[PDB]
From a paper:
TGFβs were discovered in the early 1980s4, and three close orthologs are found in mammals (TGFβ1, TGFβ2, and TGFβ35). They are ubiquitously expressed and secreted throughout the body, where they are pleiotropically engaged in the physiology of nearly all tissues and cell types after activation and binding to TGFβ receptors of type I, II and III (TGFR-I, -II and -III). Human TGFβs are produced as latent glycosylated precursors (pro-TGFβs), which consist of an ~250-residue N-terminal pro-domain dubbed latency-associated protein (LAP) and a C-terminal ~110-residue mature growth-factor moiety (GF). Human TGFβ2 GF is an elongated α/β-fold molecule consisting of an N-terminal helix α1 disemboguing into a fourfold antiparallel sheet of simple up-and-down connectivity.
Accordingly, we conclude that the low pH of the crystallization assay, together with the crystallization process, achieved the separation of the LAP and GF moieties that we could not obtain by chromatography (see above). Taken together, these values indicated that P41212 was the correct space group, and the final model after model rebuilding and refinement contained residues A303-S414 and 23 solvent molecules. TGFβ2 is internally crosslinked by four disulfides forming a cysteine knot and a further intermolecular disulfide by symmetric C379 residues links two crystallographic symmetry mates to yield the functional dimer. Here, helix α3 of one protomer nestles into the concave face of the β-sheet of the other protomer. Owing to an outward movement of segment W354-D357, α3 is translated by maximally ~5.5 Å (at I370). This, in turn, causes downstream segment E373-C379 to be folded inward, with a maximal displacement of ~6.7 Å (at A374). The second protomer is rotated by ~10°, so that K396 at the tip of hairpin β6β7 is displaced by ~9 Å. Overall, we conclude that our mature structure may represent an inactive variant or be one of an ensemble of conformational states, which may still undergo an induced fit or selection fit mechanism to form a functional ternary ligand-receptor complex.
Numbering used by the authors:
A (entry chain A), B (entry chain A): 303 to 414
The structure:
Amino acid sequence: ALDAAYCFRNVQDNCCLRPLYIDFKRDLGWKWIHEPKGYNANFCAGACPYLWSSDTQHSRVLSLYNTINPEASASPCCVSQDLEPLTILYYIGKTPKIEQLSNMIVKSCKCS
Amino acid sequence: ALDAAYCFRNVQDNCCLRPLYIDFKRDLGWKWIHEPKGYNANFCAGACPYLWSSDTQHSRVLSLYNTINPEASASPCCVSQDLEPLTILYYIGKTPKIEQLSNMIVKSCKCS
């Protein structure tokens, strides 16, 4: 998979997970989250070679088209695959509460 | 929507549907399809401004992050949204048959 272990080994031009830490107050302007101060959101970026696409007929027809006619490219797009939640601390008045924020973290990537 | 009527008006740098005709024999090497000789598959391509992403928390957090910190971009990806089937003619020996090939055509685009 295009995850931390495979992708964080070196810098790669191809579709891969990229490290990113987001500080809620500083980078999002979210003051409602008291803890943690930030988290490793990560993101997906990089070139998609033509055979890296699947799960849709249009994508596999497009991949086959591209492999035969490269010069006239319609290159696939590096997108998120596995997403994970994050537990945070917020307040209801003076009472500290905890809740899960869904799909905050990207763990792996794929080509569209 | 980022469909033919909106997108085929002019050339646009931003995420939009792009016209593409694929000839089965000539461009795919598919000799099994006798009719039609090709079809308008189309494809999605172009720049995604930061607020064009939705449906995932990670995508909206990433869009918000990007709007605040543009220079340090993790730009969204222009992908297919609505897909349509195509009916074709093939043979089982000397008998002509027809069948639907699913999700062959892209009708609209979206930003990841």
